[PDB]
Point group: C7
Chain length 171, copies 7
Amino acid sequence: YDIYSRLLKDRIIMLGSQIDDNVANSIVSQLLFLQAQDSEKDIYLYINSPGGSVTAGFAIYDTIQHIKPDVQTICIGMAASMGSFLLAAGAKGKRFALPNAEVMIHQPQGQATEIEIAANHILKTREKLNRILSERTGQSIEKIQKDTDRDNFLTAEEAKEYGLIDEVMVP
Amino acid sequence: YDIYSRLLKDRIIMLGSQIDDNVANSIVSQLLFLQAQDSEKDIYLYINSPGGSVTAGFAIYDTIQHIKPDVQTICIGMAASMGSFLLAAGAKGKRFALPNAEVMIHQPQGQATEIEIAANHILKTREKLNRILSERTGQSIEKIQKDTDRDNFLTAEEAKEYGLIDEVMVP
Amino acid sequence: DIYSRLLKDRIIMLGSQIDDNVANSIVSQLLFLQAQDSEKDIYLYINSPGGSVTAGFAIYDTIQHIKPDVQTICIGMAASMGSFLLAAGAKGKRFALPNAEVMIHQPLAQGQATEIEIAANHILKTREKLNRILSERTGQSIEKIQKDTDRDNFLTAEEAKEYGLIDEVMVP
Amino acid sequence: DIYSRLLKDRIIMLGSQIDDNVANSIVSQLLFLQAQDSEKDIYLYINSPGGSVTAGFAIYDTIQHIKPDVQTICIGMAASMGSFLLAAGAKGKRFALPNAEVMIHQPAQGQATEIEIAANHILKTREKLNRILSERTGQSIEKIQKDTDRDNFLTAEEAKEYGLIDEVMVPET
Amino acid sequence: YDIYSRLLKDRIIMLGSQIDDNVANSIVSQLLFLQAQDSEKDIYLYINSPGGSVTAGFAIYDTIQHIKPDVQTICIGMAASMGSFLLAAGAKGKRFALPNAEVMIHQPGQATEIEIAANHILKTREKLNRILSERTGQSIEKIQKDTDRDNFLTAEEAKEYGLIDEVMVP
Amino acid sequence: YDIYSRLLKDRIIMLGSQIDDNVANSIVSQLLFLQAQDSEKDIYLYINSPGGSVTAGFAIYDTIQHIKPDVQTICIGMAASMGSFLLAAGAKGKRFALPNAEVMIHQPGQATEIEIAANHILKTREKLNRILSERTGQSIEKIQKDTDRDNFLTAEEAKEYGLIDEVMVP
Amino acid sequence: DIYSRLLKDRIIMLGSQIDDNVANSIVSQLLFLQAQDSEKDIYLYINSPGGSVTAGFAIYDTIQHIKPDVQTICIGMAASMGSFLLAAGAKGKRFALPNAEVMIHQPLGQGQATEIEIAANHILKTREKLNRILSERTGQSIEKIQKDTDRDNFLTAEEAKEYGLIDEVMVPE
Ligand SMILES: [Ca+2]
């Protein structure tokens, strides 16, 4: 679509699909582009994703944390698994959801190849997810481990109360 | 294509297919872009939709309510399921249909993934749909509960009488 | 390429089966042309076997809604919803080329219509509203239209003028 | 690409079977060119094995309706509807190159829709084709009836003497 | 591949595939475009073609002869059947091949049902031989024999035969 | 896509897939283009790759070493097989990984029969090992050992191993 | 989109099997750059496992024909027709990168060659002309080349220089 090109001028990135390497490459490239345009101005990352690959999600995570600009995260529909992980990873005080957004932190995948899955288990990237979520939500590692194994769906309000977002955007 | 892009210049968006995640993302992006262009001028959402997925439809709904410009809604052919919900969700006074439009309130999937179905069951989106509809139509939620469970087809004039739209546009 | 250039001349071509995509595109073009200039005429050329009635009504309603006069010109053919849109053009401004073939017969499902669309038509009785508009725009009685839209009667351009479906056959 | 640049030169290329898609494309180019300038000649090159008669009649009628003269020029082939459209050019301005192959035989051809085939027979389009061909070749309807019911191939010079075209374009120098 | 539109600015046309109706329509369109742009300047037609449809080849042949500009023909790799025919059809004195080009005048075709019927009733095989005779300076009798056999010709032998005017030497 | 052309203006090259011939040709072309634009300014090569073909990987490797501009390598996500080899081949002091990047040096990615035959005859594994040994500061004995096993490394471990120079801290 | 931009720098990339499509592309780019400037060098980068000899001879002939010098650089692999086009660069201007792989073997006859192409190869004895050309350009005896062309002969960049296939190995800096 020609629309996502216009939105880059507004420093808006839409993450509206399952997260695989292709998507990760696209989002990362968009993040580096906007940093090159203007290293100071905020970026707006709208999220409607059911999740996906963990190494691909970490690629985006790492790029959000590395670049100079504050990356604002705004969930518009769903944020599950890596979707919700990236939602929580946005700039402090600047993580949002619309009132009818659905958030799940269950971390179960996502067209991941042999090499990726091998890396995940060997470098125990799941423990790294749990540890990062714990830091960014304030929850204990033990509560994070428990909830990421479970299939709990949170309303926007329940997501704020959990510490995944900062503010529910009520009209 | 080039017509919708040039139509976007007039702050017109066309919602003319079933609503899935792709469509929602597109409509949401278009709404955010038009807000970014001018935060004050009306937006015209044209609707010819058999409906689609609830979580996709709520993403559009939330965006309409979130943005500063008021989104005028106009049914040209059909609004069924989520299509009619979106029609009823336009700026008050600014909801329209052409004389031979067909509106159906019945909410039944729109290629909704199993994660989305689970979320909607758990978060009780169906009761929420009924409630929002009753607020936007002026009907009691009991009337809404009944009418959304049967397949009730309404003319543009009947949908006006029902409160789904404000006016039938005059030839 | 050619169609975007024609759009500048306020010319819209309807040269396929009418389904929802086509209807959405035709509706869009009509809206764009009204936004471009509200006073100048639009030229809708029709070569269509017909299709979906709900899609056709979407185009019909838009033609009647928009400000500019919409001229309808049949090239090749106008069957079912195709003939309905041809008869729906501005009065005094509905045309057919000499060898055009017009058919009023409304089938008994077309335009690869969805389950939801078929149900709406039978419940809201669109077949009767079609027959009503046709009689109003041709000058024939409702019982004449009712019989003719049930039959597979093919009309020449001149017979279609006699019928009231068009205003004039265009002279070479 | 090349075809859009050619359209600036008021050149239209008809190089395939005739269906509704092609007919609509040709019809639109003719209307565009008339909208550009209504006095200057149009140059319609024809290399076509034929196709749908109702699609063919749409092009035919459009040629006769617009104000500019439509010169027709056969390169390669003009069979069935192709040769009918060749014969449909502005009289005096129908051409073929020396090695062009013309066929007048009229055979539902070329992915014609079910409604179209029925329309052909009911409105008796075959009689109209014959009568028009007769009118613009100068040949009698009886001769055209016989010649269109046989697989009848003609050279460019034979097609000229038959009256289908006005001149064979012999190359310089 | 947008290289071909760039070459068109330099009045260069590439015929580097099997000759069918689509290729014919394409080549004919470029030739007409190049005449419209400028009717005086030479056009350069490069050939690497195994041949193809006789009626499609004839459409190209006629357009070459009909347009005002001189069309140079340059064989770069192969010119077989209709390919070699179109090579022999260039402006006189301006038909070339590169030193390692392969040229075959044997005529066996990627035509259609209607096209095949036309070729045989109108006797296009005789028209090919006749034109080959006119443009090579060879007799109808020799050409008839050679177009029936699978004689491959070097670039030098094609010059000697009269299919080209000069071999293009490094 | 389309974003990648804009990134080229910033002298950024994304290597975010398996390395086959088409990918190598593309990366090599982007490197040559950027050198041609400016021979002095740094190039940034972002790597997210499972690796792939040895011949294709060496094509990129050689071009990185040949061109004038310093090529910075930045691992985002993963660098395995040729991916990690290309990561280790960045300009000295300008090889980086993000905190959560996964690095694997193990050498076993869609390559023709000719290429596989070439690899074993011309002893390309011995070449890889020697080059890795030269750019990490680890011995050939050590690198021969670690290339055989499926040892994954964190960004910090990759730095300690000598594959990268720094981890990029948020 | 880099290739079109790269073409502004007089750079051509041959990165696949050689067939008629590839050859017609390369030939076109060579002819384009001549028309652009006939004096400045052209840079042909080679990463090719070979292909059709007819297609390769088309490129070869065009390289020799045009005025600009064509520099050849092997980046990854040059096999069969790939090697041949490598050895065919301007004298003193044939290069390979240090880890390039070169094979002179000319296969059992490649690259989707048509029955017409294969017939011409055998009749016009195209293999003999290849061996003759390689001999002239490597400075080796036709006897040695005939032997090495019949074996699967993989060479390093340095060995290719010692053979005479290239003039220099491009040393990195
Ligand atoms: Ca720099």
